[PDB]
Amino acid sequence: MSSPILGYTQGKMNQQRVGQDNRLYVRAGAAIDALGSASDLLVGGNGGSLSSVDLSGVKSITATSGDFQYGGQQLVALTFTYQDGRQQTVGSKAYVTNAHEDRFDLPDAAKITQLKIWADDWLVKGVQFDLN
Numbered sequence: 001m002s003s004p005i006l007g008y009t010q011g012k013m014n015q016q017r018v019g020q021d022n023r024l025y026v027r028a029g030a031a032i033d034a035l036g037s038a039s040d041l042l043v044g045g046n047g048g049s050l051s052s053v054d055l056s057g058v059k060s061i062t063a064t065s066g067d068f069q070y071g072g073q074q075l076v077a078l079t080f081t082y083q084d085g086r087q088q089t090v091g092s093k094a095y096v097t098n099a100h101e102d103r104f105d106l107p108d109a110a111k112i113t114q115l116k117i118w119a120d121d122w123l124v125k126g127v128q129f130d131l132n
């Protein structure tokens with residue numbers, strides 16, 4: 001049980017098992033610089049600011065891509081919406097033009113167990129989430 005690949009399958013792919021705390025760790029700013037199962041296990045570039053996302057209660061994940069203000073077509077944002085209606089976003093939608101949104105709605109009784117991250121030396125290009 002896997003999600004579609006949100007964003008682009010460019011760069012090298014790293015795969016990570018989700019930690020016991022069930023949080024997704026990020027470095028981000030105008031886009032998503034890095035992702036990982038832990039703050040020390042970020043894959044991607046060396047930019048952005050560190051933040052975390054609780055993976056518990058996730059109903060849907062929404063990717064925002066498009067023409068990046070600082071060059072190229074990039075994955076600039078991932079927005080997590082929870083069963084309680086709350087929404088947390090990592091990355092940004094403020095530095096993109098001609099943007100499109102790929103939304104992935106999780107099936108009932110699906111837990112995120114694996115992370116697949118496509119990135120280069122700068123930014124994260126794409127992500128895929130494997131379930132139970």
Ligand SMILES: CO[C@H]1O[C@H](CO)[C@@H](O)[C@H](O)[C@@H]1O
Pocket residue numbers: 028029030031032033046047048049070123
């Ligand atoms: C525009 O700069 C900001 O956003 C990018 C992300 O793409 C980071 O590299 C950088 O550290 C800043 O946070």
